[PDB]
Design a protein around this ligand. Structure first.
Ligand code: FES
Length: 106
């Protein structure tokens, strides 16, 4: 399924992500270095911070308690649509989703 990553400077990178793969896993495995994933995807580092696009902040599953708590550690600006890319799991229903990577993760 399609996922679009928009960097700080507006550069756009589109990837084909399989079911069950997190947006963080797909990013780091494809050279989208704006996303780090320091903790490995267990929601404990906040270095995979991303701003989910408004056309999907409704679609994607709401943030869990652990994510909510770890989000406070993001170094970039925390917004209403700030999510940890490692918590967004790809499915056909998310096809076309767009997320913007913060100016920084640290
Ligand atoms: S990869 Fe560490 S919190 Fe998402």
């Amino acid at each position: 399924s399609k996922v679009v990553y928009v960097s700080h400077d507006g550069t756009r990178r589109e990837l084909d992500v399989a079911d069950g793969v997190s947006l963080m896993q797909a990013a780091v495995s494809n050279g989208i270095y704006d996303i780090v994933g320091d903790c490995g995807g267990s929601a404990s580092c906040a270095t995979c911070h991303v701003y989910v696009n408004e056309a999907f902040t409704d679609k994607v599953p709401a943030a869990n308690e652990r994510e909510i708590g770890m989000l406070e550690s993001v170094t970039a600006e925390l917004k209403p649509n700030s999510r940890l890319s490692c918590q967004i799991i790809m499915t056909p229903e998310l096809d076309g989703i767009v997320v913007d990577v913060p100016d920084r993760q640290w």
